């Protein structure tokens, strides 16, 4: 037992040692964003907002206990589903557009179907293989999602048969955030263990774990590229991981930050990393030189969503006001 | 404004009518979140209040026409520190601890100080179902563990002046259960700032009154909370 | 990292140091867990950053001095009159969240921020 563990303590050694032989512009400018809309109705905590895939659409999830539908050009209700889970804390647009994911602290992961026959928003699949809270779920194809949970797995399962295809569990805390690749081949969690982990959606191992922080991970999203990610933190900084190189890149904090990020988003080119954060606004870092290229300071409490379109126009925001603000430029 | 899109702003304010419906149903009905351990007895407590691998377990009870959740936080993991933020602007956090094993006292003392000085549950008050007070009252009655052992400052610790007995009990006994108030009422006035403060009870399994004692705790929060709105208090 | 434990008699002296690294010790509420044998994991002392406030459970209340120095980042808990039945692995656990006074679950049984522990034994 006790060459066992001498035997894992040399391993690290080894890996920690091969990660250091490993490692060997003009500015963004101060980014103002004019709010062009301003999308109100939710009536409670908003925890998850997630773009469609045709750059108008939008889904939030608020922690009322329901999924809002909006035209991100007139500001419309396009739909609304009602939940029985109060306590969302994901969403998801499927790129079809037919189908949303919405998950929460209930284990399950509700899979709703937008372009039915007969009308009304209705479910199509309900996951309840976990026995953690389900924070942050993503759809792979129309008939395959992943979903990272309270207990320390990551999954990939079949819609249709409604079954893991592949559990993943080389985690030790709970998994708060979840990036599919742009390929959708591979995806990248935090679990609140200081320790990012990259895994492979068909074998089913983790290939690469990272442990830049010094504390939880909040919020996770791939560079528009797919060979790199970021993490948010409850320590008062954002990491930026490299896949191939396996370690860390840039550290997102200054010294008048004291509260942690809890929603990464990056730009649609990836030179913007907006970032939301506990002091009741938004900041926008240029991923390549860890500055502040400007604040959404818009919302009246703690920002707990981010995403940015797939055509780069806008960014939304909504903070537990109940508010999902629309950010774009000017001129 | 085309005959499309004008249909297109006419569903959205037929949502703007649901939505406004649901706001009234969410802001007359408050949330209370329901914390404790293994042996604390918030399973009973539940068991006795609510019939008058999920996640989260629902409660329904209102008195007095006011509609009360109780999310009782399930068939989760040990760790406590990301689904504890899910429960801000909530009315009221009860926190069930079971008193009658000193072993497991000092860590409900310390659950209770992470609840206390949480940084979202700052603006929380706090609802302390001391539970199981018998069992309690037989580990001194026939004493024969010393509560010093955990506790020496309880031997130079007298009956606080406000103490209301129950008819027919020992002093011990009450010098022992006030003890452990005590001790849950100094993290309370430790800090706090008079945003939230900390509400001491007397519970057992069999306490068949603990809705009223919710209805009232929870109107002291909006009570206060109002009155520091109006600077009155 | 804890380390410095090994037999000692009723009565006896010891002292405990967790060297840490990593994760900028002078930040966060420090603690001292302790997991006696057939027994579960309950929490001892306690410091703040500056070393300000501390905290006993009773059972350490006179003999075990707790100290700290953020210099050299390392956690130390001094024994001093160590009864029979006060034998265990020593964690070293750590806060969760920096620039905090709360320290949620530092005594879970399977937590992120714990040193491998120093078995103590007392005859």
């Known amino acids: 037992l006790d060459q066992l563990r001498q035997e894992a303590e040399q391993l690290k050694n080894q890996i920690r040692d091969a990660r250091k032989a490993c490692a060997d512009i003009d500015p963004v400018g101060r980014i103002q964003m004019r709010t062009r809309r301003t999308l109100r109705g939710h009536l409670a905590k908003i925890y998850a907002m997630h773009w469609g895939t045709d750059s108008r659409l939008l889904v939030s999830a608020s922690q009322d206990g329901k999924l809002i539908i909006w035209d991100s050009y007139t500001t419309n209700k396009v739909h609304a589903i009602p939940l029985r889970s109060s306590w969302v804390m994901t969403c998801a647009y499927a790129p079809s557009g037919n189908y949303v994911a919405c998950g929460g602290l209930d284990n399950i992961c509700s899979i709703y179907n937008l372009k039915t026959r007969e009308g009304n928003v209705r479910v199509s699949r309900e996951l309840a293989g976990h026995t953690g809270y389900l924070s942050c779920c993503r759809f792979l194809d129309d008939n395959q999602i992943v979903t990272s949970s309270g207990d320390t797995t990551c999954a990939l399962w079949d819609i249709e048969t409604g079954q893991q295809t592949t559990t993943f569990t080389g985690h030790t805390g709970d998994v708060m955030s979840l990036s599919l690749a742009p390929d959708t081949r591979l995806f990248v969690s935090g679990a609140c263990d200081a320790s990012a982990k990259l895994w492979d959606v068909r074998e089913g191992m983790c290939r690469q774990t990272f442990t830049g922080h010094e504390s939880d991970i909040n919020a996770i999203c791939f560079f528009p590229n797919g060979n790199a990610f970021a993490t948010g933190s409850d320590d008062a900084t954002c990491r930026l991981f490299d896949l191939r190189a396996d370690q860390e890149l840039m550290t997102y904090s200054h010294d008048n930050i004291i509260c942690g990020i809890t929603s990464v988003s990056f730009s649609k080119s990836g030179r913007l990393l907006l970032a939301g954060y506990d002091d009741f606004n938004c900041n926008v870092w240029d991923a390549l030189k860890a500055d502040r290229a400007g604040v959404l300071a818009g919302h009246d409490n703690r920002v707990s969503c981010l995403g940015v379109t797939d055509d780069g126009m806008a960014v939304a925001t909504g903070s537990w006001d109940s508010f999902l603000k629309i950010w774009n430029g000017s001129s | 404004l085309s005959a499309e899109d004008k249909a297109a702003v006419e569903r959205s304010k037929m949502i703007e009518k649901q939505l406004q419906k649901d706001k009234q149903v969410y802001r007359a009905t408050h949330r209370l979140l329901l914390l404790g351990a293994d042996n604390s007895g918030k399973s009973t407590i539940v068991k006795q209040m609510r019939i008058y691998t999920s996640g989260i377990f629902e409660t329904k009870f209102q008195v007095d026409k006011v509609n009360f959740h109780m999310f009782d936080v399930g068939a989760q993991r040990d760790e406590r520190r990301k689904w504890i933020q899910c429960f801000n602007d909530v009315t009221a956090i009860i926190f069930v601890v079971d008193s009658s094993d000193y072993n497991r006292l000092q860590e409900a003392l310390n659950d209770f100080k992470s609840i206390w000085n949480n940084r979202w549950l700052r603006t929380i008050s706090v609802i302390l179902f001391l539970n199981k007070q018998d069992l309690l009252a037989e580990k001194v009655l026939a004493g024969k563990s010393k509560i010093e052992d955990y506790f020496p400052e309880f031997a130079r610790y007298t009956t606080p002046e406000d103490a209301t007995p129950e008819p027919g009990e020992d002093p011990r006994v009450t010098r022992a259960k006030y003890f452990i108030r005590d001790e849950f009422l100094r993290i309370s006035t430790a800090s706090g700032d008079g945003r939230h403060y900390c509400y001491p009870h007397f519970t057992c399994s069999v306490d068949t009154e603990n809705a009223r004692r919710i209805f009232n705790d929870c109107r002291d929060i909006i009570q206060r909370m109002h009155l520091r709105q109006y600077e009155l208090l | 990292q804890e380390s410095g434990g090994g037999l000692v008699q009723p009565g006896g002296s010891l002292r405990l140091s967790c060297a840490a690294s990593?994760?900028?010790?002078?930040?966060?509420?420090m603690n001292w867990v302790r997991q006696a044998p057939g027994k579960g994991l309950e929490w001892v002392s306690d410091?703040?950053?500056?070393?300000?406030?501390?905290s006993y459970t009773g059972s350490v209340k006179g003999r075990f001095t707790i100290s700290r120095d953020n210099a050299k980042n390392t956690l130390y808990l001094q024994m001093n009159s160590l009864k029979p039945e006060d034998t265990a692995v020593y964690y070293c656990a750590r806060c969760p969240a920096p620039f905090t006074r709360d320290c949620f679950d530092v005594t879970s049984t399977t937590y992120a921020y714990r040193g491998q522990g120093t078995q103590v034994t007392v005859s």
């Open positions: 410091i703040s950053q500056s070393g300000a406030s501390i």
């Open positions: 990593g994760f900028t010790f002078s930040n966060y509420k």
